[model samples]
Target chain A: HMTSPFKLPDESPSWTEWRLHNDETQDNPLGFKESWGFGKVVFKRYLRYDRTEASLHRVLGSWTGDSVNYAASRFFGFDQIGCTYSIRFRGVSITVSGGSRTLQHLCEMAIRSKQELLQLAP
Target chain B: HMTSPFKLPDESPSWTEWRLHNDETQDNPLGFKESWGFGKVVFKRYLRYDRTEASLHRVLGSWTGDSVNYAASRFFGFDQIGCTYSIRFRGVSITVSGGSRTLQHLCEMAIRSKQELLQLAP
Candidate 1:
């Protein structure tokens, strides 16, 4: 008898179900973590994305870091060993380390669940 | 009388003209630096864009980093103090710190100059 934050099926044999916890350990200021896939994928809230800091420090161009981000390694291409994806919504950010297929699934489900949850934020 | 790499006027009152030199100072393996605007902008060659590495380390999404990148800071919006842009081409990468207006101007001039030099790469 467990409750899930997302409306998707609460159980999956391939991976652990999504769970929520009060995150006090990480450097995150938002203080919450939504994780799935047995720690392989994690999402947490962050302060509003800082384009300047992100652009200079990270190799990314400025246009990114505003909404969603995902990429594959040079060697692996898109869905192999080096795949990471991120999404920003309502000041919350999600980081998933897996293939693009996995990332797409998670993001799509998250969006659909949120849409049904409260019609989503404007 | 220093020979400039690009043939788009040798001098300007607004900013320093472009210059090239053997770079033995930075972490760059390319050992060459193409700079302008009194170190306000710098360009060097990189091994290649590592999509996996860039995505995880930087805030950028996956689609960027293969070519050119630029963005405005959240506070200044765009073309302000926080404006930064990057360009990648022919195994070379350029980093500029200023505003979007400056970046666009520099990139446009560089491309045009390169086109005349050898018609650019395919």
Candidate 2:
């Protein structure tokens, strides 16, 4: 069981309920922690990376017909990825880490109103 | 002819003649180009990265005991590295690239005045 004080505003155009949180008292600050909501607040978990050249970079695309945030909720902007690490040896140490991310495309399509961009409302 | 109107001033510190140029009509903006100088200006070209997990990460540490910037050119900041890339395949495409870098450390020692912190003046 989890919760949030966040609520959808009227005329928000988005229809739903949900929110994401990251613990600042922890390591991964710029990442999503737990997600919860309903009525349009669909939420998902953050993708994690492991120690491997064995990693991935993928793109997702979709077609949407509206820019409506309606009786629901939604996410805007980019998703994030970040971290910090430290390693030491002999009286010396080498520390390295980076933070970055890719855009959320499906909704981006929603933003562009793609098909409509070529043929929406004139 | 290689020349600069840049002049070093006395009691003003930093002795050198040089400036860097980056054609804004470029792909790499956050990168260094050409360097020149005499009094206190020393410059270097940006280190480029090749496509390969087959790359490296290195750390350099040095010990210097002077805060002097006289009869000299100085690079008082971190060295940077960055870039962009694009690619496509039959009926689909996967475009990816990353921009990032490691700090230049030698002078960092000069700044921390590391040894002196452990023992520079009274």
Candidate 3:
């Protein structure tokens, strides 16, 4: 599992300083305070079949110095012709994609199951 | 009431051009199209008591060269001691502010009323 390196403890001081500076400036005679922050979360998803296919092709090619090409071809069936759907979580800023049609369909099915599980809960 | 100079008719061509360009690039052999647009509107509100007070003071001062100072003072009660609340619409990119407490309260009340109207809508 992937984990984020930065934590609340690391950012607490910076956050405090930001608030303090904002307050001080707002109170100043010639200063203006602008309150800015995210009010709502947004979600967007895109299917990238073209790049995925091209990347797969490049990976299957014998390129000694190209790390990306090597990895794409080796890990994912580079010579295989299929579709890739990418699901992105905007508020959380996370992205997960399935490399092939079968995997993509499985991912969609899992998402539906998760939704059902959520609905089943209180 | 104020009106925006840029209406739908004025922006239709530019909007169409943006979409067409996006499509062409996406379909191009070596091109990748990045999808970007607002998914949700974010709201922000700020109170500028200090700048408002200073602006009032500067406006009251007779400076032959300072247009901003002249306008601020003349339009708003230059010598008054009060708070100004600025309400900004993020998605729409519009801002409306109340110059004094009475007007600010009124604006807030109007917002509440509008929200209620929205809730009541079918």
Candidate 4:
């Protein structure tokens, strides 16, 4: 429908609009948390959806990643995207097992999704 | 249906069973995170669901709360238990505006849910 490499399902056949709300900012930087103690580098996509709005109020928040993660994620992928990442939505945490080329697609698609969702009526 | 202050929905008619996986342990204590910096003491509920494993895995993981947050949550409740908190499941982050006695209900239910989800076969 829109112009993105990956096919993101229309926020489902429902929902008026679907897109990114923010960019990776210093305050809202990508953070990495591991199973053990302090030992990791960089994080990706800080997505916190505003679920209480009457109508979907255009996704508002930032998502950003670091070079190390980007390189590793991309370098580790060829046939398909693969990486192991954990994230949260609303109050629920979900783990994403990046499988081969998927991260590349998700990152770029997410970049564009934000652009499309925020597209205005000027 | 059996017991507990709250009425938890059946995992689903299709699922064979439902239950809990862990208890409050120092290893898996409840944690807290915020928009700004660290100024809080305790956190609640560390829910990590296993979305794979063929059939449903009687739920696993520990869930616990602190006395201060616990007291405040319970004290702040006239007819309802209310406290604001955030947590994650799988990899998605979620925020919970612990409202009134609901926390009491949730804590107990969650405790039971874990218990129920883990009740296994010989």
Candidate 5:
């Protein structure tokens, strides 16, 4: 028979007894094995990008300045990294797997095309 | 008087020369003096919490497990830290200034009340 873990409140069953256990050996149950690693990766990336953006802004003194233009040029590279990270983190393997062409391929096409155009310009 | 940096392209009208300066001393302009610090603080806090939550889930093997109950208890402390961090990051001096009661006070009330109830239960 299942009985309530309660004795009487001086006899009317008004209270229950509960125990709090430290459970030192109890393993966590949240399936968080990869959460910390993912969090670190996210944190590091966010920091790096934040620093890079801030540095450019600090030097330029204005978003419309020449330094800002140069920094914008560097963004292509950062975008590529972000795309790659997205694929890896999301476990997206193929171009179509995650609903688009592989970021690497797209980036290569865009970058290479720009390079070609630049070469043609001179 | 500023003259256009252009000559004739085919002697008819379009040749130009532009100079690029390295500007080694050019200071950054983004006002990122404390951005990196803030980013790091954000990242570390995010990681720590992610890890703590994950650890709890992993050991419990179920979100509703007994381990979760204990971990939830620990969360009271974590919440306090979170509230403090929020206040610090947002630069809100007082609860009234921020349009609400101070988190510290509110949390203390909740926790202390619970503690008091527990004491009175026996």
Candidate 6:
């Protein structure tokens, strides 16, 4: 009874679908959520953590062969890595929760999402 | 004119020796420095970023199979990652710089250092 909106190959079946939602009434703006084991991971975009956001863009860009800049930081913990960045075309922040293996997959999806989000923009 | 104080298996020859030094003249208390590529990376111990320090201990413990707690955070950019933790027995702080692969080696060294440092204590 679950499906993914992402088209990338599944790296970890243990990871649940990334559910996308938007809540204007909420404090946080963007809504991206997923689960691994008993831990629930959430991704949100913000107008903050300027340094962390930049670093995430660089790291993911490098991993995805996009090339933005280079840097690193943490949010969740050793088991759960977190970063924030402004989506290029969307003009909003994004947060990611992952380890390196899972992070690679998430980055791939993120880059792909960037592309789609760009195409959908005016 | 170079030597390593560390005796662990050399994982990356590109990594320069981790030099231990003390400078009460500086604002940062702990002085651990090394270099990778053109970047000069520095590690300092402080009573700060409480969350990141705890996460680092957990990650290093997990990597070294010591077991602390699990969480994550970022400091340096993609090319460089940073974290802080209180060295058990030493009652001081420590920071590390690495990606996951290099991080594993660093954690091993950290755990070993912890043992040695502990044994040296009164």
TM-score of each: 0.17, 0.17, 0.16, 0.22, 0.13, 0.20
Q: CAPRI band of model 5? A: incorrect
Candidates 1 and 6, the one with greater lDDT = 6
**What lDDT is reached at residue A51 by model 3?**
27
lDDT of 2 by residue, A6-121 (tens): 23211111122112323222222221111222233433223232222332111011111122222112333354332211211111122112222211222222222211111211
Off by over 4 Å in 6: A1-70, A73-80, A88-96, B1-122
What is the C-alpha lDDT profile of model 5 across A1-122, one tens digit per residue?
22211121111111231112223211211110010011112211111011234532332221122322232233334222222111111111111001012332323322222222112211
Candidate 1 TM-score, C-alpha based: 0.17
The residue-by-residue lDDT of candidate 2 on B23-98, one tens digit each, is 2222222211222222243322222222222311110011111222221223323543221111111111121111
The alpha-carbon lDDT assigned to residue A48 of candidate 1 equals 26
Q: Weakest 10 consecutive residues, lDDT, candidate 3 chain B?
A: B30-39
Show the lowest summed lDDT stretch of 10 residues, model 6 chain B: B41-50
Interface RMSD of 3: 19.1
Best-performing candidate as measured by TM-score:
4
Against the native complex, each candidate's DockQ, computed on alpha carbons, is 0.01, 0.04, 0.01, 0.05, 0.01, 0.01
- Quote the chain B TM-score of every prediction: 0.25, 0.18, 0.23, 0.28, 0.19, 0.31
The CAPRI class of candidate 2 is incorrect
Off by over 4 Å in 4: A1-39, A43-122, B1-7, B10-72, B75-122
In the range A2-97, model 1's lDDT, one tens digit per residue, is 222222222221222123323222222221223333123332222222233452233222113212232121133433432333333333232323
Predicted structure with the largest DockQ when compared to the true one: 4
Query: Between the candidate structures 1 and 5, which one is better when assessed by TM-score?
Result: 1
What local distance difference test score does each model get?
0.29, 0.21, 0.25, 0.29, 0.19, 0.30
B1-122: candidate 5 lDDT, tens digit per residue: 22111111111111221112223211211111000011112211111011234532332221122222232233343222222111111111111011012332322322222222112211
lDDT of 3 by residue, A17-94 (tens): 657766776112121111111112121212111223463243223111132222233334434432221121111111
